[PDB]
């Protein structure tokens, strides 16, 4: 499902009921540097999705407005991507409301719904509200640029799905820990408790036969502890074989983990360089282990600016660093896909041509997903199919909808 309509009423700078309609299925751009209305559109979308709420009302809500409502209207004609249990609806609308005191209620298609129902709806179409895989904000770019090689790898390990192997390896390690401990309990009991009692007992019997009393049950005590020895010694050789079996299992786990990480590394590395080449024509990039280490020890971003390999991301300009981090983020979207993606103010250091390159990539390489790009600066992302310009007029934010190529 994709967005077709956004209705904001009494929410933040939208004092009056405001309907923003005609959202494109592929590439939308929300602009408006001055004022708060442009960013308020994103806050309204995040509010319905579920990312002191009385402050979100028009005046918190000390002035006239005392109720706030936001409604997202989804097109649901593509039944293949329809949320399960809602296939009959050609259109699904989710509404969230605020009243004084900051309590909220949800509506689905005009009928009251539980919050869990709305959350289960969004997560059924891979809009992970709890861990947003669809929200690319400026902080994510800054975070990626400062990631150490171990953290870059962790990003790749997640896409490879190697937690599968790591959970198994953690189980076997707890198992082999109990096995290892068992031999220590055996060796303590055997060497320090069973073997001394047995040789002392054989010594008493060896004092008695020599030319007086011996314990009548000495024959039995000998045979009793002699059996306990043969049982412990065989357990030694058995628990060790279990320990060997776990080691061979873990090595097979690590091998399949390494091979799965290798396939994901090559897939990401290929897309990452091509995406960066599209966003910054004439340049290239790759993920490579740091000088001297291995894949298991982490991955590192190497950038070729023009014909020059750069030693550090530190050496890149502001715009080049944003494009490098955005290229890596976009190269990983395929592993946790979403029907909708939101790009929030990543264009501070960018030129117009860079935003045009991002826009072309959205319409082609990422065709099949709906992109909403909230621009920071005006006049960016001009090749968007639908552009919503926010201004402020008569105490409320007003949105002008445009369709380039008229």
Numbering used by the authors: 1 to 51, 61 to 220, 983 to 1177
Question: How did the manuscript describe this experimental structure?
Answer:
The condensin protein complex plays a key role in the structural organization of genomes. Based on their homology to ATP binding cassette (ABC) transmembrane transporters and the Rad50 DNA damage repair protein, the two globular ATPase “head” domains situated at the ends of ∼50-nm-long intra-molecular coiled coils of a heterodimer of condensin’s Smc2 and Smc4 subunits are thought to sandwich a pair of ATP molecules between composite catalytic sites, each composed of Walker A (P loop) and Walker B motifs of one head and a so-called ABC signature motif of the opposite head. Smc2hd and Smc4hd are furthermore connected by their binding to opposite ends of the Brn1Cnd2/NCAPH kleisin subunit (Onn et al., 2007).
As expected, both structures revealed canonical two-lobed SMC ATPase folds that display a high degree of evolutionary surface conservation at their ATP-binding and head dimerization interfaces. Although included in the crystallization construct, crystals of the Ct Smc2hd domain showed no electron density for the N-terminal Brn1 region, which presumably dissociated during crystallization (see below).
